[PDB]
Amino acid sequence: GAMAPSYRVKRMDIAKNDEECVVNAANPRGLPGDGVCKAVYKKWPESFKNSATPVGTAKTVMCGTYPVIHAVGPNFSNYTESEGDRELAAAYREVAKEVTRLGVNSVAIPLLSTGVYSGGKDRLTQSLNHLFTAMDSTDADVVIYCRDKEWEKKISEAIQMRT
């Protein structure tokens, strides 16, 4: 575990993370995809061997000894708000199980079911709160990666307000 488990946020490419493992915002078919998924594919393509997994699940594949946790959030274009919410919370629960199993002291994590899976809605708060619900019982240092300047501020405020 980390001596004083923390949450942090950085605005940069998660492929340049300084953590012991990464969470990919994966598609269910293990395809290179776009956005975070494509950056992850470029950096750790070996981690896409048999990475396909259903919505609401996480599947870890090693790139060397570096664990890539492929977490499949729902595409809110396809799911109802109710069913998508349930699957999004489930994907993060599976990430917490994998982070725990791996014994890492840190993890780099993107906000699942944002961007191309958001169904054109702002899901920062929904996705971040499911992240916290799953990760709060873990003792890994969590570093959230984002790309938007306004999202960085909102995530940073949400972290700071619970300390």
Ligand SMILES: C[C@@H]1CN(C(=O)c2cnsn2)[C@@H](C)CO1
């Ligand atoms: C891709 C990231 C996250 N994001 C969203 O998910 C989104 C989608 N519809 S409203 N907001 C926007 C802030 C753009 O930057």
Ligand SMILES: [Cl-]
């Ligand atoms: Cl960058």
